[PDB]
Amino acid sequence: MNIFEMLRIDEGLRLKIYKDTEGYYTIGIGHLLTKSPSLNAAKSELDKAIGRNCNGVITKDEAEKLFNQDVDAAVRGILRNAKLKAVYDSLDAVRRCALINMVFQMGETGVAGFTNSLRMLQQKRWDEAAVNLAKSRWYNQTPNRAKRVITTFRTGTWDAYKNL
């Protein structure tokens, strides 16, 4: 299992504009298009992103190209953020996958707000960090995905997805 398969499980694949759990306009594999209410603003962002007139619809190929870009951007973001990179460097390969997942979902800024949890991960206090991470809007809003990530940080194995 690798980062791509993991995220594919968490976000799903949709070839037509859709609304996310938050109600925002998304396409493909969790690619946020705009927090704007206008489907029109969304279609415009979408054509800008693909370089063609899509009329709200993209092929698999296109969806995958977006996905490659976004995972790349997530990793580079971690590597550019001081707080984030310190954590990342301290972690094993599976746990690193879990941090990437959070970054892809909630952006750099968002994750960097998890001060206390990040400190605990750095200290390798797995159980404790797992319990703190669950005390978030994130967990209350998308509990099943959040639990899958949390277990990944807790155990350091792919168990939560070995199911899926």
* Tokens describing residue 38: 């206008």
**CATH no. for residue 47?**
1.10.530.40
Cα 29 to Cα 20: distance, rounded to the nearest angstrom: 11
Question: Nearest 5°: CA angle at 27, between 79 and 138?
Answer: 55
> By the 8 A CB rule, do 1 and 12 touch?
no
Give one DSSP letter per residue of 30-90, joined into a string.
TEEEESSS-HHHHHHHHHHHHTS--TTB--HHHHHHHHHHHHHHHHHHHHH-HHHHHHHHH
The label of the residue with tokens 């995220």 reads 7
In which order are the strands placed within the sheet that holds 25-28?
A: 14-19, 25-28, 31-34
Task: Tell me which method was used to determine the 3D structure.
Answer: X-ray
Closest by CA to 63, choosing from 8, 107, 10, is: 8
70 is catalytic: no
Detail the residues annotated as belonging to a binding site for substrate: 32, 104, 117, 132
Tally: H helices and E strands in the chain: 9, 3
60 lies in which domain range? 1-164
Contact (Cβ atoms closer than 8 angstroms) between residue 65 and residue 127: no
Structure tokens given for 64? 């995958």
Catalytic residue among 11, 62, 70, 108: 11
Resolution (A): 1.8
Q: Please identify which of the residues 20, 47, 64, 128 carries the catalytic annotation.
A: 20
Give the CA radius of gyration of the chain. 16
Q: Provide the domain count of the chain.
A: 1
